[PDB]
Every structure is written in C-alpha cells, then in structure tokens.
Amino acid sequence: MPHAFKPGDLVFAKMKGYPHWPARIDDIADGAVKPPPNKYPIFFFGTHETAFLGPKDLFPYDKSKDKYGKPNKRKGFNEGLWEIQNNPHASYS
Numbered sequence: 001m002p003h004a005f006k007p008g009d010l011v012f013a014k015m016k017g018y019p020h021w022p023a024r025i026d027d028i029a030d031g032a033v034k035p036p037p038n039k040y041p042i043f044f045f046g047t048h049e050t051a052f053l054g055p056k057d058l059f060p061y062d063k064s065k066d067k068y069g070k071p072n073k074r075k076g077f078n079e080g081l082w083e084i085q086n087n088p089h090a091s092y093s
Helices: 061-068 077-086
Strands: 010-013 021-025 040-044 050-053 058-060
C-alpha cells in the first residue's frame, strides 16, 4: 500500500497551464527555505525550477508514465523526460 510522499519520490507534477511534468520530491537543505504547511518542494526536471505543491497535483511516476511520459514541445520537457528516466537523483545545481 502507498505511503506518504517522501524526498526522492518521482512524480509527474501538475501546474495550471502546463502539461503534467517529470519531477521529484526534493529534500530541504539545512538552512534553506521550508515549504508552506501541507506542501512539498517539487523539483521539475529539464527546467530545474522548484515550486511548492500539494499531493493533489502529484502523480507517482511508475503508475503514470505510460500516460504522461511522451515528448512535448514545451521548453525543457524532453530534457526532463531524459533526466527522470536516466538520472533522477543526481545533483542538477
């Protein structure tokens, strides 16, 4: 059975106006800004942007990749697909 989301989990993350996007739940570094309550720090592959999202917008990658893991015209997306499949836990700093 599913657990709660934890750092390192791979997802497609949904935001208004963008296709479901390859992403990971990030850790919060010591000294770094914490997310709001009930929000997770989401690192978007390809763009390498962070946003804070709740579980309603987080689709587990394994379950969802046949639907959402297809090329997209959007800037950074196809790079993002490579990252999530090929090195999802690397440093992209």
